[PDB]
Enzyme design. Structure first.
Site, mmCIF file in Angstrom:
data_model
loop_
_atom_site.group_PDB
_atom_site.id
_atom_site.type_symbol
_atom_site.label_atom_id
_atom_site.label_comp_id
_atom_site.label_asym_id
_atom_site.label_seq_id
_atom_site.Cartn_x
_atom_site.Cartn_y
_atom_site.Cartn_z
ATOM 1 N N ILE A 71 0.833 -1.198 0.000
ATOM 2 C CA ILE A 71 0.000 0.000 0.000
ATOM 3 C C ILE A 71 0.879 1.264 0.000
ATOM 4 C CG2 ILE A 71 -1.701 1.328 1.344
ATOM 5 C CD1 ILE A 71 -2.002 -2.385 1.376
ATOM 6 N N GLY A 72 2.157 1.100 0.341
ATOM 7 C CA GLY A 72 3.122 2.200 0.305
ATOM 8 C C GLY A 72 4.405 1.901 1.055
ATOM 9 N N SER A 91 8.345 4.804 7.621
ATOM 10 C CA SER A 91 9.460 5.028 8.531
ATOM 11 C C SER A 91 10.116 3.711 8.936
ATOM 12 C CB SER A 91 8.975 5.777 9.772
ATOM 13 O OG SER A 91 8.073 4.974 10.513
ATOM 14 N N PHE A 92 10.990 3.214 8.062
ATOM 15 C CA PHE A 92 11.770 1.984 8.272
ATOM 16 C C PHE A 92 11.135 0.719 7.689
ATOM 17 C CE2 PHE A 92 14.812 4.353 10.300
ATOM 18 C CZ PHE A 92 14.476 4.840 11.561
ATOM 19 N N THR A 115 7.411 -0.996 5.203
ATOM 20 C CA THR A 115 6.464 -1.083 4.092
ATOM 21 C C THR A 115 5.119 -1.478 4.692
ATOM 22 O OG1 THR A 115 8.287 -2.425 3.175
ATOM 23 C CG2 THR A 115 6.516 -1.782 1.670
ATOM 24 N N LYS A 120 3.331 -3.521 9.048
ATOM 25 C CA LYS A 120 4.609 -2.978 8.580
ATOM 26 C C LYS A 120 5.693 -4.053 8.625
ATOM 27 C CE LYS A 120 6.923 1.259 9.893
ATOM 28 N NZ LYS A 120 6.428 1.674 11.261
ATOM 29 N N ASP A 174 7.870 12.730 14.081
ATOM 30 C CA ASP A 174 7.519 12.720 12.648
ATOM 31 C C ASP A 174 6.230 13.458 12.266
ATOM 32 O OD1 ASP A 174 7.191 11.926 9.841
ATOM 33 O OD2 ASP A 174 5.941 10.293 10.591
HETATM 34 O O1 LIG Z 1 4.074 0.334 11.735
HETATM 35 N N1 LIG Z 1 3.740 1.012 10.524
HETATM 36 C C1 LIG Z 1 2.481 0.879 10.247
HETATM 37 C C2 LIG Z 1 1.349 0.162 11.006
HETATM 38 C C3 LIG Z 1 0.024 0.338 10.208
HETATM 39 C C4 LIG Z 1 0.485 1.151 9.035
HETATM 40 C C5 LIG Z 1 -0.317 1.605 7.975
HETATM 41 C C6 LIG Z 1 0.276 2.369 6.947
HETATM 42 C C7 LIG Z 1 -0.528 2.856 5.816
HETATM 43 C C8 LIG Z 1 0.011 3.405 4.654
HETATM 44 N N2 LIG Z 1 -1.051 3.737 3.857
HETATM 45 C C9 LIG Z 1 -1.002 4.334 2.525
HETATM 46 C C10 LIG Z 1 -2.296 5.011 2.022
HETATM 47 C C11 LIG Z 1 -2.144 5.167 0.494
HETATM 48 N N3 LIG Z 1 -0.958 6.002 0.159
HETATM 49 C C12 LIG Z 1 0.345 5.504 0.693
HETATM 50 C C13 LIG Z 1 0.277 5.155 2.200
HETATM 51 N N4 LIG Z 1 -2.218 3.417 4.471
HETATM 52 C C14 LIG Z 1 -1.930 2.893 5.630
HETATM 53 C C15 LIG Z 1 -3.011 2.459 6.547
HETATM 54 C C16 LIG Z 1 -2.756 2.275 7.923
HETATM 55 C C17 LIG Z 1 -3.792 1.868 8.786
HETATM 56 N N5 LIG Z 1 -5.049 1.656 8.327
HETATM 57 C C18 LIG Z 1 -5.318 1.837 7.012
HETATM 58 C C19 LIG Z 1 -4.331 2.242 6.085
HETATM 59 C C20 LIG Z 1 1.659 2.660 6.991
HETATM 60 C C21 LIG Z 1 2.463 2.199 8.056
HETATM 61 C C22 LIG Z 1 1.845 1.444 9.072
#
Ligand SMILES: O/N=C1\CCc2cc(-c3cn(C4CCNCC4)nc3-c3ccncc3)ccc21
Ligand SMILES: O/N=C1\CCc2cc(-c3cn(C4CCNCC4)nc3-c3ccncc3)ccc21
Lengths: 264, 264
Positions: A16-17, A20-21, A23, A36, A129
């Site tokens: 989904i993207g 910070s360290f 995916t 992640k 951040d």
């Molecule tokens: O620990 N790192 C984490 C834990 C959860 C987590 C979720 C995301 C995350 C990244 N996106 C997208 C959206 C589209 N454009 C690029 C980024 N969406 C989410 C998301 C998170 C929670 N619920 C729904 C979606 C990133 C990092 C971490």
């Protein structure tokens, strides 16, 4: 009390993207979960601690406005599991897909933002951040802050950056108010529907610009239905001077009173 | 770390009801929160252990379908704090306020209350008590499971009790299937909108009759919209015999399967 998932119980679907360290994926574990993963082969001694760091901070966060940490896993790469949230990032809603949020609850977003921010600060937690990228939206109904990759007790994202922190000072620029500025940017974003320092194009210049006291954000542009005490709150928070900013134990309290007024 | 809320940080508005060893309140603590207090002036050594065991259980449930336990308080009454949910418990919505939930999502309520129930079973948790009175509903979405006052490693709420457990047998009637059974009654509740055996009026005769396997619940009551696969699932869970009942990992995926055959 180990919040580690027993080996391989987790699934992982598409990317989904990034962040910070790691995916992010829409994997499965007892339901739908946001996960992640390291995406690396071997773990760095500094990355080792960067992982173990985010765990110990998230273990402190049982709140309805903080992205619910569910579990971790060192086996099969380093990983962090949270609740999956239907919808998107606040950044996407605002700048990527242009959602016309109505004021009534455009402020309710800011409410929940501070609702959680107050919880973090009172429980010692710094976010560092921030961003509005990290304001993951649940159903367009509940605000949850995520990705605690930079939190305590070489790429960047200059915009949500307190001038004092942009300068780089004394090993300790990050502070309570350093979050509050970045939060002030979020308030601004909601009030304007776009990023600060929009009509320029030089990232490298902005760094020096605000980080010396030049490029203050343009308050004079914002949706005209904005409250009179909201500009006041955006201004108080985005203030350049450090200790001159107001803390969260009075931010939301100054907001939840103004939420009463605008209904008419 | 220690989920002990420093005394007087909490706040408590009007009452919400009772049950599970105390009294329920809408309160305030970094925002709206559901609070279960003791109300008793001098705490009992048997209650002392009932409180601490409840909190030990809650300490292991970070899930989107379990009522997000937020903290506790021993100072100034014995107390437990958890997330507030605008909107009521299912028991109300169904038998008190009689909301006309469509099948499209009536099963989506059932899927979640299994989604949750699976997690506990997997993470060692037996609920013991399992009511529609315990299934708190977040507005119209998100099913979150209630208190664990009974849940382990004088007032009885019969109706949601497996025959084997109504009898009492060997100090150890409460088990996996016990939870599963009472969940099946919850399924019946959803498919009928009625309480079980709603057309008699002798609580102390249902107790015997179901306890000796004479009073089976009426399956030929569910709405016409209900799927044929669902009526099969209710029956499998409302089995009189102990070992014959199907475990949650199976239940959940079985409902998931059938959920995307409905849309048309
Ligand atoms: O620990 N790192 C984490 C834990 C959860 C987590 C979720 C995301 C995350 C990244 N996106 C997208 C959206 C589209 N454009 C690029 C980024 N969406 C989410 C998301 C998170 C929670 N619920 C729904 C979606 C990133 C990092 C971490
Ligand atoms: O720890 N056990 C707990 C903690 C909070 C808590 C609250 C309740 C509870 C009981 N009711 C009533 C309402 C009137 N009709 C009969 C049931 N409503 C709630 C409630 C649930 C979620 N949010 C707010 C209130 C029960 C147990 C526990």
């Amino acid at each position: 009390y180990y919040w580690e998932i027993e080996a391989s119980e987790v699934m992982l679907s598409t990317r989904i993207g990034s962040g910070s360290f790691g995916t992010v994926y829409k994997g499965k574990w007892h339901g739908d979960v946001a996960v992640k993963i390291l995406k690396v082969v071997d773990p760095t001694p500094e990355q080792f601690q960067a992982f173990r760091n985010e765990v110990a901070v998230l273990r402190k966060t049982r709140h309805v406005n903080i992205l619910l940490f569910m579990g971790y896993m060192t086996k099969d790469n380093l990983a962090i599991v949270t609740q999956w949230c239907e919808g998107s990032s606040l950044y996407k809603h605002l700048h990527v897909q242009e959602t016309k949020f109505q004021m009534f609850q455009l402020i309710d977003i800011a409410r929940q933002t501070a609702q959680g921010m107050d919880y973090l600060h009172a429980k010692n937690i710094i976010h560092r951040d921030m961003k509005s990228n990290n304001i993951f939206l649940h159903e367009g109904l509940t605000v949850k802050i995520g990705d605690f990759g930079l939190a305590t007790v070489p790429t960047g994202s200059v915009l949500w950056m307190a001038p004092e922190v942009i300068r780089m000072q004394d090993n300790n620029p990050f502070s309570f108010q350093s979050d509050v500025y970045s939060y002030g940017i979020v308030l601004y974003e909601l009030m304007t529907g776009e990023l600060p320092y929009s009509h320029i194009n030089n990232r490298d210049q902005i760094i020096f610009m605000v980080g010396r006291g030049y490029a203050s954000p343009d308050l004079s542009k914002l949706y005209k239905n904005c409250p009179k005490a909201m500009k006041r709150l955006v201004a108080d928070c985005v203030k350049k001077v450090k200790e001159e900013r107001p803390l969260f134990p009075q931010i939301l309290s100054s907001i939840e009173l103004l939420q009463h007024s605008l209904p008419k």
